[PDB]
Structures are given as structure tokens and as C-alpha cells.
Amino acid sequence: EYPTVSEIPVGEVRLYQIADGVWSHIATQSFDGAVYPSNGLIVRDGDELLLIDTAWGAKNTAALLAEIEKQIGLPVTRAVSTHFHDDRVGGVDVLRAAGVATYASPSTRRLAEVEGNEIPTHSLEGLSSSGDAVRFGPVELFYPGAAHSTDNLVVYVPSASVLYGGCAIYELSRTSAGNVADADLAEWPTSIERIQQRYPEAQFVIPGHGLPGGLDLLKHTTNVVKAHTNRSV
Ligand SMILES: C[C@H](CS)C(=O)N1CCC[C@@H]1C(=O)O
Ligand SMILES: [Zn+2]
Ligand SMILES: [Zn+2]
Ligand SMILES: [Zn+2]
């Protein structure tokens, strides 16, 4: 029942209810002739919504806000981008123009600036050291260490036992490394273990791209990352 890339035309966004007060949002983008899905999260924050990640671009993110307005009907007041890439910050300007307070760690903001990407307005303190966690309303933000990127954050919704891994966690169907241009391959397995150690009770694990699963996604990602690490030249 989870929306797949073939079921979402580019420019459209689907919402998927994971648990009470927790949705993922699913959008698509074309890249090199293939179409990829991308996930973010929406978490009910009292009578407001906390958004995790843009929908990968300005058009998709406008569609995301319209879909939230139609389906949930609560204001998006804050958004957190979990790393500096365009599937996470692309659309920040759309969110900002709609009155959403946009947040990212100083690490993400610095890297987004270097990359020429959109830059969330607010800085999330307290996440600069591997293993750092901070509360952000109905979620915990966790910096597990460098993995898919040096700044990647994961997001845990304690009320729903939902772990949003972002692009540091691969879906099961991905059996070879994705975009690792900004990755810390040497640290990625250790960073994943930090996620496992902090959230062993997680019941739903949402990858940055593709189908949700359980904590099995963590060891799966480690296996794929290690296989890529050992690629023979
Ligand atoms: C824009 C995102 C950032 S994780 C990205 O690098 N991806 C995911 C796979 C396809 C696309 C790319 O390779 O550009
Ligand atoms: Zn990325
Ligand atoms: Zn990604
Ligand atoms: Zn696997």
C-alpha cells in the first residue's frame, strides 16, 4: 500500500500515514533518465505540523504544502532538513515563503551554502558531535555521525516508534550504493550502529528513498555500504 515511484507522476506528492500523527511524504524526480522516489516525514506537533525534509524541489514542495493542506489541514510551522542535498533542502525557499520556519544544523547550513543550495533559516544547536541528540517538539533529532553525508541527521518519533533514517538508510530493494559523493564510507557502519544502539525499539524505519521497513534496514544498509567500500578496481 506504500506509494511507489511508478504511482506518482513527477510534480505530485503523496502522503502515507505511518502511525497516529506521523506521515511520510513521497515525491519523485527524474535523474539521468530514471525516476527516483524520495521520502520525507510529517509529524503532528499539537495542532501544528513539523515537516522533515522538502519534497525535492520547489514545484514538488509547493505540491507537498497543497497536499498537506488538503489531507491534514493543519499548518506546517517548522521544517527540518536532515542533510544538505536537494532532496532535503530543495524547496526551502517555498517553505519559507509559506511562513514555515526552516531549520537545519550548522553543519547542514554550511554545506548547503558551499554547494549553492537553499539554506534553512534557523540553526539547530547541539548536534555537531557524533552521538548528539536534541529534542525538537514531537521528535528527537540525532546526529549519528557521518554516513551518507557528514551532516546527516536521523529523526525519531518516540510516540509512534518511527525512525526516519533519511538518506543514511537504504531501502531493502537498493542492493548497491547510491549517491556516495559526499559520504563517509569509513564511518557509515559505525554511524548506523549508533542509530541501532539509540533506537533499538524502533518499529518503523523510513529510508530517504523507497519502501519503509523495520530495523533490518540498518544492517542491510551496512551490508551495501561495506560491499561498495570493498569494490575491487
Ligand atoms: C538528490 C539525491 C540526494 S541523496 C541524490 O543524490 N539522488 C538519489 C539517487 C538519485 C539522485 C542522484 O543521484 O542525483
Ligand atoms: Zn543525500
Ligand atoms: Zn537522498
Ligand atoms: Zn540487504
- Shape verdict: globular
Extended strand count? 12
How much of the polypeptide forms β-strand, as a percent range? 25-35%
Strand order of the largest sheet: 1-2-3-4-5-6-7
Q: Give the domain tally.
A: 1
Count of DSSP H/I helices: 6
Class derived from helix and strand content:
alpha/beta
Helix content: 25-40%
Question: Cofactors and ligands present?
Answer: the ligand C[C@H](CS)C(=O)N1CCC[C@@H]1C(=O)O, zinc ion
How would you explain this protein's 3D organization?
- This protein is of the alpha/beta class and 233 residues long.
- It has one domain.
- It has helices spanning 58-71, 86-89, 92-97, 106-115, 188-198, 216-229; strands at 13-19, 22-31, 34-45, 48-52, 76-80, 101-104, 122-123, 132-136, 139-143, 154-157, 162-166, 204-207.
- Strands 1-2-3-4-5-6-7 form a 7-stranded mixed β-sheet. A 5-stranded mixed β-sheet has the order 8-9-10-11-12, with no helix packed on it.
- Strand 10 and strand 11 (162-166) form a beta hairpin.
- Helix 5 (188-198) runs antiparallel to helix 6.
- The longest helix is centred in the N-terminal third of the chain and has 14 residues, at 58-71.
- 50% of the residues are buried.
- Bound molecules: ligand MCO and zinc ion (ZN) (3 copies).
- The site of one zinc ion has 6 residues, from loops.
- Residues 83, 85, 148-149, 167, 179 line the site of one zinc ion (ZN).
- GO terms for molecular function: beta-lactamase activity; metal ion binding.
- Zn(2+) 1 binds at residues 83, 85, 87, 148.
